[PDB]
Amino acid sequence: MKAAVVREFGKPLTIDEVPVPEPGPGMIQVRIQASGVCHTDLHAAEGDWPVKPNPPFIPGHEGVGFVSAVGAGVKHVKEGDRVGVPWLYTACGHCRHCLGGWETLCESQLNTGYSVNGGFADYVVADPNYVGHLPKNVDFLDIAPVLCAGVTVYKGLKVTDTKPGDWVVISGIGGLGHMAVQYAKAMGMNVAAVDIDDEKLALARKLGATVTVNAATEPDPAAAIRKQTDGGAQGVLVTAVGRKAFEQAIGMVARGGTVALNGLPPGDFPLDIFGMVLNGITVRGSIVGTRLDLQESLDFAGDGKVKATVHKAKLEDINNIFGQMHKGGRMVLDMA
Amino acid sequence: KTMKAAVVREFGKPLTIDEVPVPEPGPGMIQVRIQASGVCHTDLHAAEGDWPVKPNPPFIPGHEGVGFVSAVGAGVKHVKEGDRVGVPWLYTACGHCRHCLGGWETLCESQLNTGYSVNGGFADYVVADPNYVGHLPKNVDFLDIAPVLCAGVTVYKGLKVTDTKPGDWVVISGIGGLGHMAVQYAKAMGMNVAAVDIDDEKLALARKLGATVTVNAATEPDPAAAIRKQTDGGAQGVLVTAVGRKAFEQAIGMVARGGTVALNGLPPGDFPLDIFGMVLNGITVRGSIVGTRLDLQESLDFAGDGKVKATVHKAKLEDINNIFGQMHKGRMVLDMA
Amino acid sequence: KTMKAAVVREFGKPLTIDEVPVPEPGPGMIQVRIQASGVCHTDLHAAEGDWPVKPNPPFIPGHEGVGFVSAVGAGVKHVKEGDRVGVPWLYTACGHCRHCLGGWETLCESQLNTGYSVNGGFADYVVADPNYVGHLPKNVDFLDIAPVLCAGVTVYKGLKVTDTKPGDWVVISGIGGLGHMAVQYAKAMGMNVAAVDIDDEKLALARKLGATVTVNAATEPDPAAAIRKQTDGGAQGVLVTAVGRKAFEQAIGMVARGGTVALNGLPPGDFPLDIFGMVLNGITVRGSIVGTRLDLQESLDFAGDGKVKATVHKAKLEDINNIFGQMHGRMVLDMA
Amino acid sequence: TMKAAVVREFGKPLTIDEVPVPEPGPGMIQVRIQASGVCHTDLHAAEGDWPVKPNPPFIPGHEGVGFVSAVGAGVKHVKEGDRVGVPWLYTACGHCRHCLGGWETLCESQLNTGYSVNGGFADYVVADPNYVGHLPKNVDFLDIAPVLCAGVTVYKGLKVTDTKPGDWVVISGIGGLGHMAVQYAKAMGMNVAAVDIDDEKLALARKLGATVTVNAATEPDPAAAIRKQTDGGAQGVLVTAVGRKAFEQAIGMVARGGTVALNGLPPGDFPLDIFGMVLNGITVRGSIVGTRLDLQESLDFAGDGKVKATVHKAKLEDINNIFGQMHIEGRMVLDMA
Ligand SMILES: [Zn+2]
Ligand SMILES: [Zn+2]
Ligand SMILES: [Zn+2]
Ligand SMILES: [Zn+2]
Ligand SMILES: [Zn+2]
Ligand SMILES: [Zn+2]
Ligand SMILES: [Zn+2]
Ligand SMILES: [Zn+2]
């Protein structure tokens, strides 16, 4: 097998040859055919997060492919199913979160490519109770970003308490941003995109955004959004969480609205507690959703209502991709 | 004829006990004879004009004024004379926007506020909208029902927006008037109440009022670890009643993953926020002000059954400035009876 | 002055098109020059007086009267002299009961109804309450917006109380005056639609409007079996628009375990209900007839955005009786 | 060997047989049974008069509590000697939409205790470690067996009434489920009205926390009395013992927009006034025992001393007698220790 192993933090990933994993009880083995590249993989490679991985680990939580083995205890998943290995790898199974349909909040959970070896390889051992099952009518390259970006933005839009026909701003139309635009349009929600570029605003207009505001050349983007979204978006999905981005997001959401945050920035953002209380503003965090959310997002991608603009790549240029993310659609490694 | 009120002639200057004229009830408006008006930090902040949107002087503060209906407007339909009503913080609302039609009239924009945008309950008489006054339980005295109009409804709605259910842990941070009121409300909702405050007599007050877990912020290595230990993993809901600067960080540490932190205070300036922590833990941070008419009526029902009572420190109108002095360093309530 | 009005002089007798005094609004009231007026089976029942609570003749039926605001009473504050408004089923509410305070004025014990408890839209003028009249989008004419005051709001609220989410399955049964509106709303609200009806012109219309699944009730050995086949196990929401002993039983069969059955009709009599089946399957059965002011506003937003278009056949007042005869597509009494 | 009250064939007295003890194969736990509630579901499993009949010979009973006598291969979390229960739900598929949504009771390929696999009416029952309730330590097995079926059923039925603390829930038909539901709705911040055909049961409810009683027999109509003593109608109606009279009365008792939750499993159909049910906005939902999380929550209420089932101790060899007796105050719990 060939992987991209973070042997020591900070130093660039080296394309080594590591042994082929083999599944244990209730464990399947996936033959990766695509593997999305996310900024969470960059932060796992560098290691600048409170709780860190123990290198050498293989990153990547967007690996999709075939089941090439079942570890002799697996009941449902067959050998040939189109599966993927998302962020959530396992869970305890008995805590209040695992029992309430909220296993992403489990405190003993593992994370693919963070606490266990991930998608940046040919074969991965995964847990069949947590893998996502993929629709047939979608190729692996266009379904890999949905395993972390699609589910993240779908759950983020679900936690804004927004219904169809309500205004949701998608802030920072990147890869996650364009995926979120597609999901928000597929849910009946009016969309108002806000980014710093104008080509991305054109892309959002193509994707069903009826409102666009340039967050870099408008006098105040929040006033523009409140003008066009009938007095403030009912939900704001902040996709790339930065400063003046969280600020404009707080300014754009209408009273009683919800600011879902789908990024993991560093530092401590200021929060106008007075304004949040006076406006009844909810601010909620959400990293990639649960198994039901993943399944529903894969079903949105099986109807051709959400498509991921993907730039194919081999394994050997992963470093460059991280370089491209260090400076600043979606980069899917091509294992097929 | 004439009435006595605590007017704010200019911001930051001592409130003046004036003999202002009695307000008259406009068409669709009732006139209430105040009997016990509560004092809140909001009254001091309105008199001091230290908020982003400021009141317009001269104005009479006070949004916890309970009493009898002394007059009815030319057209009112459901509030009659003698109805023991209390004029809350939410004075009016437009009644046609997406918030007032949805039953979220406290989020409206054309809304007024008693004692802030209009004259309030620090007087012998007031003028209020009958569609927005609360209806008090007849088995509770005015002096004991005045704090419910702001403190009680604020903590009640704050507990309702924590999205907890009976049997869940709720940490009532900052046991002041709001803190003890919220302890009682969380007990009356079948929730297990952990209590955190720097003082200790207030922690014993929490103990008697229903709290089974009490943590002293001053004398623990870190209060959030004690809360997480004694609540089996962190409270499902945290209600920060006294958000000064670090109760917020302690609350964020106390809450469990997927839990909700509800803020009821109006502290100055901006507070840090571990967006990484709040996102990775699934935390929800929500801001809560008093609450709507349904929530006010529900809190009044709770105060009518005797499951929630406030410790009041009765005082007179002429002491208002002195009270405000004490408020620069137990819900204070004035007595017009 | 005088206006034309299809008065129900007494129950049983046919409607009498008469010259009746022009209704002048009073303190806190407005007047709506009725350009168009939809026709519903509720109006026929009011004309026939065959309900447990009956109207009080002579009364003017009609709860879909749209038009301009002609006059305003001394006191009105939000509507102006000439806005496109409509008078829906809900004419007033107490304002202070727990239902009104909670945003549920459709449940007020003291609600007045248009065309049932007070006069209505089957006339050239009406006196309505400005706090409860819907506000019409200006890009849709009265003829095509009259059905949205009863049918559109009814099916919108029914779909909302099915507790469904975008990507779910809702089975619309009875594609008629309500069913095609329901198909359009369920497609605009983001749900997968399955239509069920006895007729095949109705099924063709539904398949056009976005019903990915259509099953014929009378040309299928067992319909519910085929619906469950083509919905992966049944629908999370089942909207019964034409409530029948056949329709309700088939709806119970079609819904999935845990799903909701929304009954939007008002049939007569007492219907069978397998309590064992309901409890075992965890079925939920609700009943909603017309949505609230905010749900009306949301349905009007869907209508004005273009995502929902009623199919309308127009008439004049003078043949309302014939329509009532034909009451044994949505008829709209054009009188602009 | 054990003392299994086997249903060797449907319709016959249960043979008290010395069957072999089941063994904990891979991924399973074996429980030694110290107590076991008796429910009418067990009687209907014995008589097989339900649509999906069981398959004899089988051991009924879905309330068996005790210690984990043995742990099978692969099991990681449940230790031998833990106080576990074996509830109505035995297993689920683990991958369907209902399972992933926290609704594994709604599953299609689920198993049932004492209905589709051998159950609690024995000394040892082999259960699935992922679905066994984990009992508190301050409650006896004889007093915690009824919670596994009656307590969970009433708790979940109260939760699906979508009522909030301070609401009104009418508990119709005080029995085992009825009295446990009175206690649960009390421990939820809810006001509890009680309706029953006896009168000693109304006294028991009046003592267990209920504040409104109406005799379903000696009254001209229970619905009017309930509507008058709940101020317009109850927000929730938990129907514990369900019948054509009880269902009609419940639909009459509930306020508009309220939920009528059904816990019984009666044969046949029932009349539904669709005109009234649609005009009134009523919701008629049917609830069965409950999910693993709700079982945990019910056991937590039972441990904390807020819910106690009035257990009437029996032995194993008179189960048939109880079955005849079931053709009954409190919950007949067999004592197998
Ligand atoms: Zn990622
Ligand atoms: Zn867990
Ligand atoms: Zn206050
Ligand atoms: Zn408003
Ligand atoms: Zn009302
Ligand atoms: Zn209608
Ligand atoms: Zn049972
Ligand atoms: Zn399942």
Author numbering:
A (entry chain C): 5 to 332, 336 to 343
B (entry chain B): 3 to 331, 336 to 343
C (entry chain A): 3 to 330, 336 to 343
D (entry chain D): 4 to 330, 334 to 343
Copy text from the publication:
Here, we show that Paracoccus denitrificans assimilates ethylene glycol solely via NAD-dependent alcohol and aldehyde dehydrogenases. We report the functional and structural characterization of EtgB and EtgA, key enzymes encoded by this etg gene cluster. The cryo-EM structures of EtgA and EtgB, determined at 3.1 and 3.0 Å resolution, respectively, provide a detailed insight into the active site of these enzymes and a starting point for structure-guided mutagenesis.
We performed enzyme assays confirming that EtgB is indeed an alcohol dehydrogenase that utilizes NAD+ (NADH) as cofactor when converting alcohols to aldehydes (or vice versa). We found that this enzyme preferably accepts monoalcohols (ethanol, n-propanol, n-butanol) as substrates. Nevertheless, when compared with NAD-dependent alcohol dehydrogenases characterized previously, EtgB shows favorable kinetic parameters with ethylene glycol as substrate. Therefore, we replaced the analogous Thr44 in EtgB with the smaller, isofunctional Ser to test for improved conversion of ethylene glycol and other diols. We also replaced His47 with Asn to probe the effect of this smaller amino acid on the active site and the proton-shuttling system. However, EtgB H47N and especially EtgB T44S H47N showed improved catalytic efficiency with propylene glycol as substrate (ca. three-fold and ca. five-fold improved compared to EtgB WT, respectively).
